[PDB]
Amino acid sequence: VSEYIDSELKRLEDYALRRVKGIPNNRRLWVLTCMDERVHIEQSLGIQPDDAHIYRNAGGIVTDDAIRSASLTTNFFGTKEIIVVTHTDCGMLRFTGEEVAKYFISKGIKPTEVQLDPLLPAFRISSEEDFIKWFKFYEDLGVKSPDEMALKGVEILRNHPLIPKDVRITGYVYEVETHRLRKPNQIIYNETSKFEHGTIVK
Amino acid sequence: VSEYIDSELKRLEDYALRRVKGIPNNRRLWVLTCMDERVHIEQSLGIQPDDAHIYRNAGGIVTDDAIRSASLTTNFFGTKEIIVVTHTDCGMLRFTGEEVAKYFISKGIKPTEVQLDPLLPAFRISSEEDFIKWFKFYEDLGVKSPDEMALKGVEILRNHPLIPKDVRITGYVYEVETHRLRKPNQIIYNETSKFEHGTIVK
Amino acid sequence: VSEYIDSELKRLEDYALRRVKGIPNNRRLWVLTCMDERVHIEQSLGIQPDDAHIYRNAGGIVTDDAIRSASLTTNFFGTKEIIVVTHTDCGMLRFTGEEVAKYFISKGIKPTEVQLDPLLPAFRISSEEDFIKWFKFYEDLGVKSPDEMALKGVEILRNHPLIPKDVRITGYVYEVETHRLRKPNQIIYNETSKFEHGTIVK
Amino acid sequence: VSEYIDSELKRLEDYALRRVKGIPNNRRLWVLTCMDERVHIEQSLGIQPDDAHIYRNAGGIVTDDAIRSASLTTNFFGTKEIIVVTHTDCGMLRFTGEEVAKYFISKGIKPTEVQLDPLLPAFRISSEEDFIKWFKFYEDLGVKSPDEMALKGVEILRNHPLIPKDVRITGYVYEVETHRLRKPNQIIYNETSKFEHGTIVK
Amino acid sequence: SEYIDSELKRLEDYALRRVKGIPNNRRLWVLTCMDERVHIEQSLGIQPDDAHIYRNAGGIVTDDAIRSASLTTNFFGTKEIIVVTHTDCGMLRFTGEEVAKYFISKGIKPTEVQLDPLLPAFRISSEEDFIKWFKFYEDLGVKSPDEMALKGVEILRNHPLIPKDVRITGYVYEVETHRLRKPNQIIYNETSKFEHGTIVK
Amino acid sequence: VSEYIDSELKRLEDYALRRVKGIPNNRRLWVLTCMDERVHIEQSLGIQPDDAHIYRNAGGIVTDDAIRSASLTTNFFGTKEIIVVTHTDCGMLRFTGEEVAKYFISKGIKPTEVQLDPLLPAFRISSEEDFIKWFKFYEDLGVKSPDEMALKGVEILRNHPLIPKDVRITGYVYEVETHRLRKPNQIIYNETSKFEHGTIVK
Amino acid sequence: VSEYIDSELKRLEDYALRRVKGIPNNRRLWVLTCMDERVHIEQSLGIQPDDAHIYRNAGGIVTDDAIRSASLTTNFFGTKEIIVVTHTDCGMLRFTGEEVAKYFISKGIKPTEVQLDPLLPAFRISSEEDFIKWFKFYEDLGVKSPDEMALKGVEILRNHPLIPKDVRITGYVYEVETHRLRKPNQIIYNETSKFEHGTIVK
Amino acid sequence: VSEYIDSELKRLEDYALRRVKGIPNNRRLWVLTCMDERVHIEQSLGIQPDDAHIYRNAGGIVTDDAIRSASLTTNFFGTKEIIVVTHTDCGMLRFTGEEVAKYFISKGIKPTEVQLDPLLPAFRISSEEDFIKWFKFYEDLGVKSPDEMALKGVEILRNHPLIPKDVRITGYVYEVETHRLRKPNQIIYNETSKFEHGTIVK
Ligand SMILES: [Cl-]
């Protein structure tokens, strides 16, 4: 009876000390996605709780923190695959950085002296236009759709030198209205409601 | 029967357009936690995915992207509660920025000229000591434990201009060895395995 | 125990002899929908097995048989509500009557002499143009979408003298790619993937 | 992980465009059955939702619409099996066409003028006898039972040129009192409650 | 302690129901068939401890049925009797003449065979009586299990050994549907022919 | 799918007409047991619903009806095994035939002229003493226990000319206090509550 | 969200520190019973996992350790009820102290210098006859049944000064053959398989 | 069928008379653990009740009764494995023998005269310090933690001449705050909340 107990204790030790012992996540996967509450990421990727490192922010956009996190998981925690997942009805496609900056300026905030990263004072902007850009709203970045942002994020990570390129990278769009992924720019909803010449079953 | 169908259609319409219509998440909650695969945050808070905007990065540390994200959720998306959740066996407590810096430098990386935020060129460091600091490992920030990091995060968020002062902020530490939250510095294990004078039952 | 047995047998008798005893379906409902295997109609309407009379044909289009069936359920079996449900990727929006007629003529069908209703010889056509229109493909009827066809079906039934004025009628479109209904012409999939000004959460 | 996601996206595209791509239902099966609420057809045939095209009308009787729908499903959508399912306590075996006509005539209807198919004006009758016959009640057709009607349907479809002769056609009767099919004319209930010579077990 | 003691008394009562004068949970006695397809408790919607269930070949009223029914009603407090015949009954597939000859072929002498070893007083003294003893439906003039259920109800209703206060009802177990029906009330035929229906108002 | 339906209907037909077609019960078994409500016979024998013919009377005692029934199942319905099951706290071991006789005499019953078997007039007793024996109470038959009665039942059936000699016969006693069978005269309850010299485990 | 968490931590703290904080078991119960593997005590007593302090030894016999443990649970941990459960087929009723003492002596054990309690050297015997008594076999204590032993245990604990007088004490016997309790010396089994005059149901 | 019944009666007879027949528990296992209500021992060892003899007292401490019981289970009942399981928040680590003795002495108890083992007069202490020592509180025995007590108990049993050499002995500590066993002095909880140099995943 004791040999099973000993076995299960060692298993529990490995799980509790993965980052000490150099054990990766179960699918060696890292996911860049959205903090949005409707983006239920795990079921749409077909993954289990311990399968991936899931990074989440406003819009699922590549920030310095996204790169910081991506660079550690890949280089140090054995991640070999990245999946970028933007989503539909994203808040970053509902406002602009100009509106947001003016909103804060009207409450007394001063973009030039606001401490954007208290733990890293080296990061300053010294411009109101850089403060607008910092929020990373779609229209300010010149992006029209989450599909375009998914591919854009894939490209940024693909070209960045902090990531090793044995790593495979792919981008998808989460559809909040159907809780399902699509490939960027592959929309079948217009095609199914129009005439289209079908073929006879062989 | 059609009226049941009509109300359910309006229900799913609002769900798909929450961000246009000004509908918050179900608990008006925002969580700052870790990307670690063993941190099953929803289960440990007793919530469903639709209840919160969950921000996740390497370490559950307050970054500019965390502040960016938290600032938008609180001011524009109606979030009134923030919960910071660090975790045990955090990868950020297993290495130093000095180790990580020398690793990348050994692969030909140049700290001063690497684009840390490609979409925000204004993000620049011009120093190796700043590059080491940018990774935000615990020891380099002077933090000894996830408990201390949970309390540090809450304190920064509480004193930040971009976050409303009426937002309720709280800290916890996710224990990967038990899949359970604890309050910072309130660890039940040590106390139960030593002598402590008991009380006679009344 | 005998009293319980007897009341369950009465219950069985009424269910087995609803049509003899003048008992309607559980929701006094009649559905016109499509035979398509992807149209799972009951779950999309939010009803149970015994709730409705469900009429199904090629395309969910109003035919004489549909009118015959609706006429009997409304006037004699006590149905007070009608729902019409067309669907996406319908076979009737994928070919033309020209195609189908040409195919059948090549296999030896005589448009004028073929028995369209073997049990009712009074139904005759005497033209190849009538044979094409009889198949009721969308393009031949001048209908551009399932949304348009759902509304057309509602109107025809709404204005037909064999269907009582007191019967309430509504139309919907079944989406095969989401297994869910929509109101005709209410498409949000374009709106969710492009910019649209949002409102701040109150 | 992405490969299995891409594999699932392709599969869902095929499902949404079956009629474009020339993909049949999962059984190549077509069912002519009744609209009656007590006829739970899929349960009785032991089939899953995507298995068959299911036509449903008043009585599960072969009409022009059923033939129309059967001709398309077999020739164009690759259906290789037809099953005709009538049912017990069918409303078409509870009334006559004469009753129904007199009822409608008393409410100002004129058999010769009423448009039986608004989308096909070429369908005219020019007689009250044809109008009475159009309702397809069992009595006016000389059909005594759902058993006899199921076989009549099978016969009609077997010898119709719009349905390919290599399609297998079978008939059954749905018993609403048992929620179970039976073969036509093979009713076990009489046989078990009379005297009948048995055989000794060896 | 007190809840264990209460449970101990409950188990004692259960173990000694016949000593203490405790009836079954429904005061019910069921006369039914031995057939393996007659799952009687399920069909009556009853739990195991609800009824005394008498079972024989055919669910036919015999001296043993009257004996058993007499004790359950008068001494064990049964107030309800349910008689349940069934479809495809073996007693409706053969006759006593067939079965008699079969045993005669195997060298059994109807007059000599001891029908109740524990009761020598039961003698028949005729070959016809031996045939009637098997109680096949034909030899009793019964066409259906419906008729046999009604006949069994009628016999028990009129018998002086069974209290007149007791409720007696008959049913027919349908093996093809695992369900009961009322005698002579068969829905299966009525649903498959023309019947003047009524319009819903 | 017709082949499947046909195959299931045949399986129903054989089950419904077992006694016509000459099909035995599943384990070719007949059981003589008691009508007592506490004797849950099937689960105590370890059998399923369709496994056995179960005969039940007042006391699990061999009577003419038990012999009649057992002769038919063995000779005609293919039963090759018999199991007799008496039980603890049997009502037949709780009263006497003399007591029951007196009770009925007080209600005005005439032992000479009571139709003991209405369907068989040839059964008569012509004695007060035979009326007492007819009830078959344990005391009157000279039976000490249910153990003795189970073995006495086995003997009677084993020596009876109407029951085939190759039929296997075994006796048991159902313990109502523990819902479990025992072999006759195997009482271990005394043995477990007193001293008995055990042996060292090898 | 943070309120349910704090509340669940409080409950976790109380549970983990019941002995420090002076919380009793859920029913204020202490059980003296046997180590035997067939004695499933909690289910026989009808109690839950956190209801009782369960003391278990060889035989369920009152030893110094039982008194030690009983006096602490009652005086300091708030236990107000005691239940003694001996069992049938107890190993202490299958052997004698003499043969066991002889067994150990044959292995080279020296009764007068064997440390019976290494943590308490004050416990000495200095006699082979004391060694025999120390094992506490039923025959050496003059106890003939588990029923007598249960009552003896109750009486010893009832008169002991280290056990409070307001504590309620009750004795039972666990039947390993039935997995069930009985009152001492009340055997149902002998009464059920014998004749006994019953009563008519009123 | 009787074949299965006779086989199951043999199994139950063996089960009821294991001590007579010389049949061990299912795993030949003896457990020394605590009477604490929170210690759910069988689920933590992955065993069923029939798998082991479980000794339980205040503390899970090796008393004379523990040795008595262990010597019988090992030598006579075939036990080949011993498992010692102390626990966290143990009452024996919450008070002292001095306090307990004082409590009893003030209530009128005379240490030297009280019968510590009524059935064994040979057990005498003749000292107040021995009375304090008799309770076996951790502090008096010089034991720091349940971990230390688990190893102590294992060592005492392993060196005792009444327990065979070949019996395998192992110690664990049950954590009430996680219902989980750990190896003595192998605590992951402290290691996971402080810095420790990790290794890069290969
Ligand atoms: Cl987002």
Ligand SMILES: [Cl-]
């Ligand atoms: Cl992390």
Ligand SMILES: [Cl-]
């Ligand atoms: Cl269709």
Ligand SMILES: [Cl-]
């Ligand atoms: Cl119908």
Ligand SMILES: [Cl-]
């Ligand atoms: Cl197709």
Ligand SMILES: [Cl-]
């Ligand atoms: Cl039968």
Ligand SMILES: [Cl-]
């Ligand atoms: Cl034999």
Ligand SMILES: [Cl-]
């Ligand atoms: Cl024991």
Ligand SMILES: [Cl-]
């Ligand atoms: Cl020694």
Ligand SMILES: [Cl-]
């Ligand atoms: Cl000596």
Ligand SMILES: [Cl-]
């Ligand atoms: Cl304890």
